[PDB]
Amino acid sequence: PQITLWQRPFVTVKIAGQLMEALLDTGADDTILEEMSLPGRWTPKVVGGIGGFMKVRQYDQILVEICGHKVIGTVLVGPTPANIIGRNLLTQIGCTLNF
């Protein structure tokens, strides 16, 4: 798909049997999802945004189905105001900016 940017670029994603929408975000290095049950071990991490820092749980080798495409990578889970698909996964769906 080609997507213009007049609206927020949301896509549907499926992770660990659960469905949600997330923003395709070229300004994000990492992928961050709202508090959810992901099974297994994790690592404490903190991410910095525009207003300061946020504590998250880092989960590795997570399967993400993004617009149906299957990719695997690191997902951060915590009290984010928006689910964000960052470049770590965008590269895996062949995402480019064109202008």
Place this chain on the structure above:
Amino acid sequence: PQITLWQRPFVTVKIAGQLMEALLDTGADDTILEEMSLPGRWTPKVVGGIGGFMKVRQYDQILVEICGHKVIGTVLVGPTPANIIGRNLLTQIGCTLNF
């Protein structure tokens, strides 16, 4: 041009005679630049990101040359960790996501 996302998508921008780099950011509604001297009236505003909220100065009808091409729009100025070109200006340079 087409830009892949293995690295952060920085572009050179020129605003009020000053040069800087900024992130092309599909996850940003608005454009925010580090503290700089923009002449003229402004409006107090707060933007909410990850980590919380940040106070900014809102400047309207500002000319921005993004990768050499001219657009006009609102720019927020404040203590941002990164200069960010948001969708308000991305739409004006015909920016699309392709995946």
